[PDB]
């Protein structure tokens, strides 16, 4: 006899937890690598204020969290509980982010 | 009040017209209207249909499981 939570019960717990908090949810280094990597394509031997990288992260996480809200609604609107790529795509299409 | 959800189905499908089959929701509606019935009757007719499908006595002409149309001994 072991203990198990039903699929979804922890999901809910996680939601409550992360809504409650404000801390950045992507690991700071892997992000910073991704930034520099993308920046290379525009100009090589570029330096970044640490604050500039943090600004980018805040903006990115914010953006995605928001996109997920909208995506979630698109899922539910299709009588689903599970978000899928077509949920995101709809959200971005309606937002005028993509054709 | 009224027994043999088996006899209940048979009496609702008798009354129901000569068809390719007879679909649950059309029998569920007949049994609830014609006899002193409960709530879990909808969920007992669902168990009543599956035991009659099981015994070869009723057989289903279209669909699968307990959403579809069912026929009697020929």
């Amino acid at each position: 006899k072991p203990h198990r939570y039903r699929p979804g019960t922890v999901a809910l717990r996680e939601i409550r937890r992360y809504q409650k908090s404000t801390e950045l949810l992507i690991r700071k280094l892997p992000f910073q690598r991704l930034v520099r990597e993308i920046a290379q394509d525009f100009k090589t031997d570029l330096r970044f204020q640490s604050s500039a990288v943090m600004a980018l992260q805040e903006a990115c996480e914010a953006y995605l969290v928001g996109l997920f809200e909208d995506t979630n609604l698109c899922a539910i609107h299709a009588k689903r509980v599970t978000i899928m790529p077509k949920d995101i795509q709809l959200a971005r299409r309606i937002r005028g982010e993509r054709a | 009040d009224h027994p043999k959800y088996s006899d209940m189905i048979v009496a609702a499908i008798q009354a129901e017209k000569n068809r390719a089959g007879s679909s649950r929701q059309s029998i569920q509606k007949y049994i609830k209207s014609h006899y002193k019935v409960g709530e879990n009757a909808d969920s007992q007719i669902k168990l009543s249909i599956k035991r009659l499908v099981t015994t070869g006595v009723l057989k289903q002409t279209k669909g699968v499981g307990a959403s579809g149309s069912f026929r009697l001994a020929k």
């Binding site: 939601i15 690991r27 394509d41 570029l46 805040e58 997920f68 599970t82 978000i83 899928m84 | -």
Partner: protein, 80 residues
């Protein structure tokens, strides 16, 4: 290159949780990475463009802030 994978499944899961998402298709993690990349490309491109115009080699917070405002994603608390 390909640090995009550094944006781990569990990290995306976390972001979605803050977005009030309960269940998440497997396909979403790659889809999200794609979106996140386009976002950063667009913002950074503009940020760097500000940097170049200031004849600097160091991207400032302000460079990003100005970029985000341009993109209509105004950001408070980095010198707005």
């Amino acid at each position: 290159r390909d640090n995009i994978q550094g944006i781990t499944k569990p990290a995306i899961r976390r972001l979605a949780r803050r977005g009030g998402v309960k269940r998440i298709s497997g396909l979403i993690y790659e889809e999200t990475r794609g979106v996140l990349k386009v976002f950063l490309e667009n913002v950074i491109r503009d940020a760097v463009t500000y940097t170049e115009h200031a004849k600097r080699k160091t991207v400032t917070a302000m460079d990003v802030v100005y970029a985000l405002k341009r993109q209509g994603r105004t950001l408070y608390g980095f010198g707005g």
